Amino acid sequence: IQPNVNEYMFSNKFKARVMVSRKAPEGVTVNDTYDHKEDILKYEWFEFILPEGNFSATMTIDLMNNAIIDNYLEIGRQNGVLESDIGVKFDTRNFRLGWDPETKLIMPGVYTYEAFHPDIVLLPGCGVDFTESRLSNLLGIRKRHPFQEGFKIMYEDLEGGNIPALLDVTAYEESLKIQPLEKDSKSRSYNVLEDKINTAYRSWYLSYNYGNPEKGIRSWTLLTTSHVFNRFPENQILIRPPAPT
């Protein structure tokens, strides 16, 4: 027959923009008195190749994430990029289930971890480009307009899809102290976004279903049917997505 992922069908490539370097401006000479909020963040595009084969649908998302992380291992971390800065992460869960209207946090302190639909999560300055890729159809994310040249979903395009912050359940129980979770185990930042309600990560599935129907990503996208892969088991954003079993 023919494998589900091969170069003839163009289902092994996809372009994505990720953070490349994090360096203080000029000669700051980063010391104790450095804010680290003035770091210069440079982003860049790359074409990510996956091996060929069948690769299911969840295993496809596992390999797509692995391609992003391989780039971070090659150029990313060596130029000051943190694990808190990995922008492109492909997930399958609803990041808004634990949300509470009064606190506007997710009280369970953990995202639901139940597979619903393939998703794209991004950090500011990042994005994915499926213009020359057929992996979008495999993720169940297609253009709402068939004749729309290009299919580039980026961070600026996902208005209203910010992943809510996790409740600091430990502080809450130590009482009430309804506090957002700033970091995780191993002290890598969740990016709490100052408003103390949401994170800097933006989910496509959130902007589609919980965002503005017009002037959002739903306006021109369509939701259709679809420990090396869990390098960050403690991070609730970067954890291996659940499988629809």
Side-chain angles (χ1 to χ4, degrees), residues 3-7 9 11-25 27-28 30 32-34 36 38-41 43-147 150-172 175 178-195 197-213 216-245:
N4 169 268
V5 175
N6 56 67
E7 265 190 355
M9 295 180 58
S11 54
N12 56 270
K13 293 182 175 182
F14 72 92
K15 289 176 181 175
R17 191 183 190 184
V18 294
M19 188 183 309
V20 165
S21 66
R22 169 169 251 164
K23 35 170 66 68
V28 154
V30 284
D32 282 9
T33 68
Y34 188 51
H36 232 263
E38 317 193 45
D39 281 306
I40 304 296
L41 306 179
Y43 300 76
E44 195 174 6
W45 287 94
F46 297 104
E47 190 176 38
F48 297 83
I49 57 103
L50 314 178
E52 301 187 1
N54 258 3
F55 294 134
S56 167
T58 293
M59 198 192 317
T60 304
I61 292 177
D62 291 349
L63 294 182
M64 295 180 72
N65 287 310
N66 176 69
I68 292 293
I69 304 159
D70 275 0
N71 167 274
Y72 169 82
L73 298 175
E74 186 195 10
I75 56 98
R77 53 170 180 178
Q78 269 63 56
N79 277 315
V81 176
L82 311 169
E83 292 154 320
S84 315
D85 300 349
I86 303 183
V88 177
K89 198 269 184 175
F90 302 91
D91 207 308
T92 63
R93 95 198 77 154
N94 189 328
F95 285 102
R96 206 183 178 80
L97 270 184
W99 199 67
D100 185 296
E102 300 182 38
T103 69
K104 295 178 179 301
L105 295 172
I106 55 140
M107 313 314 291
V110 154
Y111 303 113
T112 179
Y113 200 70
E114 182 158 311
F116 277 131
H117 182 279
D119 184 15
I120 316 174
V121 177
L122 305 172
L123 280 179
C126 304
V128 300
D129 188 2
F130 294 140
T131 301
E132 297 175 350
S133 177
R134 286 190 158 176
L135 283 172
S136 73
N137 297 264
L138 203 54
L139 300 187
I141 308 172
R142 304 180 187 180
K143 300 179 297 183
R144 185 174 290 272
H145 310 143
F147 313 133
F151 193 9
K152 194 191 293 274
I153 299 175
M154 298 192 63
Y155 185 89
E156 298 86 354
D157 306 324
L158 304 174
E159 276 186 2
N162 286 81
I163 295 179
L166 305 92
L167 175 75
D168 198 333
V169 56
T170 58
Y172 185 96
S175 293
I178 306 184
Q179 210 176 56
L181 188 52
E182 304 283 323
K183 54 182 181 180
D184 72 330
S185 306
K186 306 199 168 199
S187 288
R188 88 188 94 204
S189 181
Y190 273 147
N191 314 322
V192 88
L193 209 65
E194 201 92 308
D195 72 328
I197 282 302
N198 304 316
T199 72
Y201 299 85
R202 278 183 180 173
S203 162
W204 173 87
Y205 192 80
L206 294 185
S207 184
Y208 189 100
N209 299 282
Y210 300 108
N212 197 349
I217 200 74
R218 179 192 264 258
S219 175
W220 55 278
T221 61
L222 197 74
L223 208 136
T224 93
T225 316
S226 64
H227 48 63
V228 171
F229 294 132
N230 191 22
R231 288 162 164 264
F232 320 100
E234 312 85 359
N235 187 281
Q236 274 294 322
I237 294 291
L238 300 176
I239 200 179
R240 181 191 175 107
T245 63

